[PDB]
Amino acid sequence: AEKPKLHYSNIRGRMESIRWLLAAAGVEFEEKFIKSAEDLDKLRNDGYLMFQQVPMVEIDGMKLVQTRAILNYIASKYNLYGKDIKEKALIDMYIEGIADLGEMILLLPFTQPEEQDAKLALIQEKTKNRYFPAFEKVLKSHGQDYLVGNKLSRADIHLVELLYYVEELDSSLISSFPLLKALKTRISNLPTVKKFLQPGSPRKPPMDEKSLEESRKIFRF
Amino acid sequence: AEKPKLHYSNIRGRMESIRWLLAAAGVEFEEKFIKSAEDLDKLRNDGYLMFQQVPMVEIDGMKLVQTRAILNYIASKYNLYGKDIKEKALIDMYIEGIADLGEMILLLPFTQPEEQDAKLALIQEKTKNRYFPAFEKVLKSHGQDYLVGNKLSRADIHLVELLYYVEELDSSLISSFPLLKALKTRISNLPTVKKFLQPGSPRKPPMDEKSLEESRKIFRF
Numbered sequence: 001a002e003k004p005k006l007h008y009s010n011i012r013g014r015m016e017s018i019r020w021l022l023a024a025a026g027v028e029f030e031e032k033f034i035k036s037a038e039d040l041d042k043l044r045n046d047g048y049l050m051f052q053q054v055p056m057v058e059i060d061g062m063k064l065v066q067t068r069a070i071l072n073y074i075a076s077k078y079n080l081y082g083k084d085i086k087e088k089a090l091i092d093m094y095i096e097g098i099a100d101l102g103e104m105i106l107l108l109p110f111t112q113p114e115e116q117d118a119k120l121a122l123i124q125e126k127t128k129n130r131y132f133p134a135f136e137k138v139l140k141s142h143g144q145d146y147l148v149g150n151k152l153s154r155a156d157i158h159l160v161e162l163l164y165y166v167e168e169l170d171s172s173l174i175s176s177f178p179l180l181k182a183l184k185t186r187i188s189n190l191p192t193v194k195k196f197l198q199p200g201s202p203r204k205p206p207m208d209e210k211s212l213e214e215s216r217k218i219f220r221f
Numbered sequence: 222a223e224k225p226k227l228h229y230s231n232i233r234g235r236m237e238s239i240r241w242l243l244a245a246a247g248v249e250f251e252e253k254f255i256k257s258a259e260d261l262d263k264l265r266n267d268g269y270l271m272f273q274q275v276p277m278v279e280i281d282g283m284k285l286v287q288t289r290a291i292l293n294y295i296a297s298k299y300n301l302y303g304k305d306i307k308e309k310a311l312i313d314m315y316i317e318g319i320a321d322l323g324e325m326i327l328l329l330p331f332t333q334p335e336e337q338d339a340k341l342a343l344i345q346e347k348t349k350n351r352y353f354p355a356f357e358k359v360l361k362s363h364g365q366d367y368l369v370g371n372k373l374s375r376a377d378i379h380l381v382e383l384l385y386y387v388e389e390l391d392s393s394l395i396s397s398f399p400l401l402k403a404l405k406t407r408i409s410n411l412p413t414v415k416k417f418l419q420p421g422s423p424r425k426p427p428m429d430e431k432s433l434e435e436s437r438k439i440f441r442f
């Protein structure tokens with residue numbers, strides 16, 4: 001059948017956790033790279049973009065926009081969203097805290113070149129003091145190998161993704177959290193993630209000066 | 222069972238959309254109002270807040286934090302989140318757009334009178350040209366009384382909520398949208414919303430100097 005088609009530019013940005021979750025669920029996908037402002041304009045005028053924004057994913061006859069609409073849908077389809085609504089609640093709660101810290105990190109490279117050192121320090125503070133202890137606490141509390149339901153879920157996917165970007169920004173920040181390192185190893189050892197982690201996968205690099213200016217032209221900022 | 226218990230200060234804030242949804246869905250609740258920074262530290266010390274922040278709702282034996290976790294749980298519990306995974310995706314798509322316009326609106330009063338001229342003009346332009354057309358379009362396509370599935374969903378609730386704040390800010394923005402206007406009248410006349418709209422209800426007023434000063438000292442930002 002059809003592969004989901006991801007509409008975005010050749011960067012991490014808001015499309016990345018979508019890629020991770022599809023690739024962790026072993027789903028093959030295609031990408032159609034926006035290279036210019038005209039490419040996005042073309043999407044807007046064809047009426048493919050409900051709020052005239054990307055990410056957009058074509059999946060199952062649907063033109064889906066809004067990172068959460070898409071992630072949610074994908075998580076459900078491939079059974080990574082828990083077994084019942086009480087499990088979704090814990091899952092939603094965990095990932096929305098992961099999204100909060102992940103939003104900080106995503107916006108960091110788009111910060112003013114001097115504003116960045118202060119912005120990082122807040123990321124170093126919220127990671128060490130707030131989010132990492134929250135997730136280490138959940139693991140220690142139930143003694144289990146995954147975040148919710150004693151079973152792999154999207155919550156496991158999203159968190160380890162974050163651990164990889166934290167490692168990039170400050171390798172020391174995970175050092176006192178051995179249940180998160182252990183989760184990072186277990187999840188990373190999974191056939192689909194391991195493969196997505198290897199070279200040549202559709203996993204994307206950090207922002208550089210090239211793609212940062214690419215993005216300013218394309219989205220108009 | 223015990224009434225859902227709501228932990229916040231006496232403001233609209235990130236809790237107000239929870240207040241609307243619970244009210245639209247016929248659910249009586251209790252609100253434990255945070256009145257100081259010391260009230261917030263207590264919840265933090267008692268280990269009540271996973272990420273040391275509110276909104277927090279106590280419901281069904283959980284201490285739920287993160288507006289979207291809370292909201293999503295209530296929607297599903299009360300059958301306002303669609304009949305299946307495909308309809309969830311339409312609703313998710315809509316309410317994330319509604320939440321983006323709402324978030325601009327939410328931050329405006331905390332933004333100082335310097336940028337208030339700039340931040341309000343953006344709400345105005347995006348309301349008129351992006352969001353309002355998107356939802357008018359949806360209502361136009363099926364001619365039905367409700368957004369998704371010819372039946373009250375949480376999208377109708379978050380939208381009509383939104384149409385009340387947009388009316389506060391600029392009563393003219395809806396004026397060229399006959400179907401949004403008529404949606405507002407019908408959701409406002411449903412017994413439970415009509416009751417929530419009545420004097421004396423848990424519905425909260427806009428920000429003012431006093432509430433803003435209180436918010437500064439409670440949340441220390």
Ligand SMILES: N[C@H](CCC(=O)N[C@@H](CS)C(=O)NCC(=O)O)C(=O)O
Nearest residue numbers: 014052053054055066067068219321
């Ligand atoms: N609500 C956001 C929309 C994403 C967004 O900020 N869109 C950007 C791409 S990173 C865009 O297409 N910008 C053009 C615009 O907003 O005018 C989401 O959760 O995905």
Ligand SMILES: N[C@H](CCC(=O)N[C@@H](CS)C(=O)NCC(=O)O)C(=O)O
Nearest residue numbers: 100235274275276286287288289440
């Ligand atoms: N991720 C948001 C968190 C809301 C938030 O920014 N919380 C603020 C006030 S509404 C707070 O409790 N401030 C204390 C702090 O974060 O340090 C949610 O939906 O719950």
